[PDB]
Amino acid sequence: PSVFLFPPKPKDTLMISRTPEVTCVVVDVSHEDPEVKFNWYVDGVEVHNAKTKPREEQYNSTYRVVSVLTVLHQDWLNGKEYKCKVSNKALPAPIEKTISKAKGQPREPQVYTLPPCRDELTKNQVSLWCLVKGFYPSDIAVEWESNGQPENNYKTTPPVLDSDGSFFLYSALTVDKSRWQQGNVFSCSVMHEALHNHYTQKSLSLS
Amino acid sequence: SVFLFPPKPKDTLMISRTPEVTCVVEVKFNWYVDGVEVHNAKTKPREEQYNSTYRVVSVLTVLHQDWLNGKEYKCKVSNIEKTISKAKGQPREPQVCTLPPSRDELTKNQVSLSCAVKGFYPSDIAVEWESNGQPENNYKTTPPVLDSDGSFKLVSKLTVDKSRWQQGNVFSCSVMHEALHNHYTQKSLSLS
Numbered sequence: 139p140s141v142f143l144f145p146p147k148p149k150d151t152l153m154i155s156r157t158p159e160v161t162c163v164v165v166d167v168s169h170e171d172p173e174v175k176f177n178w179y180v181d182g183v184e185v186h187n188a189k190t191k192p193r194e195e196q197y198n199s200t201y202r203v204v205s206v207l208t209v210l211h212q213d214w215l216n217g218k219e220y221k222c223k224v225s226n227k228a229l230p231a232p233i234e235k236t237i238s239k240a241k242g243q244p245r246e247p248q249v250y251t252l253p254p255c256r257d258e259l260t261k262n263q264v265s266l267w268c269l270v271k272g273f274y275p276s277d278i279a280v281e282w283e284s285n286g287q288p289e290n291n292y293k294t295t296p297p298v299l300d301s302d303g304s305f306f307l308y309s310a311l312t313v314d315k316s317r318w319q320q321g322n323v324f325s326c327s328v329m330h331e332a333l334h335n336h337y338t339q340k341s342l343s344l345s
Numbered sequence: 346s347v348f349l350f351p352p353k354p355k356d357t358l359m360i361s362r363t364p365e366v367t368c369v370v371e372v373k374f375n376w377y378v379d380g381v382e383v384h385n386a387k388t389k390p391r392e393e394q395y396n397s398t399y400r401v402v403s404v405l406t407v408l409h410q411d412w413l414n415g416k417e418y419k420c421k422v423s424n425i426e427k428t429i430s431k432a433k434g435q436p437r438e439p440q441v442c443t444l445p446p447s448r449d450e451l452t453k454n455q456v457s458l459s460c461a462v463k464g465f466y467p468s469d470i471a472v473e474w475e476s477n478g479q480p481e482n483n484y485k486t487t488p489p490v491l492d493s494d495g496s497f498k499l500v501s502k503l504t505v506d507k508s509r510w511q512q513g514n515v516f517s518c519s520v521m522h523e524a525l526h527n528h529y530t531q532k533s534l535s536l537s
């Protein structure tokens with residue numbers, strides 16, 4: 139019997155409209171000891187509002203049991219610790235698992251847009267670049283758009299630890315050449331806790 | 346628990362360096378190559394750990410063309426078997442694109458020279474920076490990320506003083522990869 143504790147998504151913690159949840163997942167729950175019990179704590183204080191989905195037996199004849207705790211957005215952003223305690227008569231001692239936001243002072247992202255270079259314009263497609271650096275923690279969200287509408291053909295690298303302890307990434311949005319020299323303006327939305335309104339936006343166009 | 350690790354990319358692309366597959370775990374290893382067994386391995390002893398258990402590693406040297414032709418390397422651990430190989434598929438040439446800093450980036454005193462390397466396959470690749478033929482220290486590369494078409498891309502970011510960029514030093518992004526001619530290519534960049 140194994141337990142896995144998953145954090146909220148970054149977008150969910152950064153917008154009061156959305157619902158951030160911590161998710162405790164238990165797998166390899168045998169048939170001879172099926173019942174599972176979750177105890178939740180935030181900063182060592184037990185909470186009772188979690189919601190434990192009914193068990194679902196997998197195609198390997200073991201059960202998957204999930205427990206979802208909704209967190210207050212500013213609790214997570216203030217680094218409370220969420221502890222999932224899982225109890226099962228199969229186990230000798232119950233399994234504890236703790237998750238939190240990374241410790242460390244938040245640092246504002248620097249969002250630099252970058253046009254293609256001289257030598258990619260031979261091809262039909264064109265990559266426009268969005269450099270985001272110097273942020274902490276690595277929880278962040280990056281989206282692209284133009285004309286007030288989302289772009290789908292973008293890929294974003296994982297956050298990468300920099301020399302100075304912050305993080306950086308790049309987002310590359312690839313569009314048609316004819317879209318870019320028409321002179322459509324493309325924009326790089328970035329969501330991170332250390333930005334004002336948790337949001338910023340940098341636009342890009344030929345000139 | 347056995348874990349079998351590939352060679353480092355630049356080890357396989359330079360004839361002068363020695364590429365090694367590493368098998369991390371009394372223990373005995375045998376090794377094969379295409380099922381064909383091989384006795385050139387060197388188990389290196391030994392490492393007791395921080396939780397009162399073993400950490401026995403064997404290391405097998407590999408011929409560069411062998412691994413680059415994609416041959417499989419078996420690590421038998423006697424007390425389990427694991428295998429690895431080069432990524433199968435057609436090596437696609439990296440496209441190497443140097444990008445200078447942004448307009449708003451020059452408010453601050455350091456500057457980010459970017460180097461987009463996209464379109465390469467397999468993901469095994471090495472990226473370095475230099476100026477006046479001397480190594481850079483302050484750069485970081487992102488892991489290769491899979492794209493729509495099945496190639497990979499990454500970016501490598503070197504930071505230096507606005508002093509040196511505004512002064513006009515030429516910086517170059519070196520890329521090593523099997524699909525490139527002589528396993529190497531180099532794109533330079535400077536202001537003007």
Ligand SMILES: *[C@@H]1O[C@H](CO[C@@H]2O[C@@H](C)[C@@H](O)[C@@H](O)[C@@H]2O)[C@@H](O[C@@H]2O[C@H](CO)[C@@H](O[C@@H]3O[C@H](CO[C@H]4O[C@H](CO)[C@@H](O)[C@H](O)[C@@H]4O[C@@H]4O[C@H](CO)[C@@H](O[C@@H]5O[C@H](CO)[C@H](O)[C@H](O)[C@H]5O)[C@H](O)[C@H]4NC(C)=O)[C@@H](O)[C@H](O[C@H]4O[C@H](CO)[C@@H](O)[C@H](O)[C@@H]4O[C@@H]4O[C@H](CO)[C@@H](O)[C@H](O)[C@H]4NC(C)=O)[C@@H]3O)[C@H](O)[C@H]2NC(C)=O)[C@H](O)[C@H]1NC(C)=O
Nearest residue numbers: 142144145146147158159160161163165166196197198200
């Ligand atoms: C029997 O079957 C079960 C079930 O499998 C199913 O049935 C079988 C029959 C097959 O058909 C199979 O294909 C089916 O899927 C088996 O159960 C599996 O057990 C393995 C372990 O053996 C589990 O593996 C872990 O996976 C983690 C990632 O899990 C996610 O990703 C996969 C896809 O890759 C999904 O399938 C999972 O469901 C998980 O998906 C995530 O789930 C979250 C919970 O809902 C989502 O978050 C919520 O999302 C909602 C909205 O959706 C909201 O946003 C909420 O706010 C949010 O909470 C999340 O979005 C979703 N993500 C994705 C991408 O989909 C790994 O993380 C984990 O790795 C850790 O532990 C390993 C040790 O086991 C270790 O090697 C790793 O290195 C890593 O260790 C961690 O490392 C990190 C750093 O990277 C550190 O930070 C940590 O500290 C460190 N922790 C630890 C403890 O070490 C595991 O590899 C697998 O999840 C599980 N499957 C399922 C479906 O649950 C069972 O094994 C079978 N039995 C046998 C005997 O085979």
Ligand SMILES: *[C@@H]1O[C@H](CO)[C@@H](O[C@@H]2O[C@H](CO)[C@@H](O[C@@H]3O[C@H](CO[C@H]4O[C@H](CO)[C@@H](O)[C@H](O)[C@@H]4O[C@@H]4O[C@H](CO)[C@@H](O[C@@H]5O[C@H](CO)[C@H](O)[C@H](O)[C@H]5O)[C@H](O)[C@H]4NC(C)=O)[C@@H](O)[C@H](O[C@H]4O[C@H](CO)[C@@H](O)[C@H](O)[C@@H]4O)[C@@H]3O)[C@H](O)[C@H]2NC(C)=O)[C@H](O)[C@H]1NC(C)=O
Nearest residue numbers: 346348350351352353364365366367369370394396398399
């Ligand atoms: C007691 O405590 C010990 C020590 O803490 C524990 O041992 C641990 O066991 C874990 C398994 O339970 C294991 O986790 C797996 O890790 C592997 C790979 O891990 C890499 O990352 C670590 C850093 O994050 C390193 O510490 C590891 O050593 C390993 O790093 C790689 O190591 C190679 C050898 O050092 C090296 O390759 C060679 O390098 C040389 C010189 O550097 C040459 O160039 C040569 O050419 C190379 O070949 C790599 O460069 C190096 N890389 C880096 C970045 O450091 C991981 O693959 C595995 O993932 C599993 O799960 C995924 C899905 O989750 C699945 O797809 C995989 O198939 C796989 O099954 C696990 O996460 C720990 O690594 C290990 N710790 C150490 C230090 O070895 C145990 O808990 C206890 N002991 C016992 C016996 O129980």
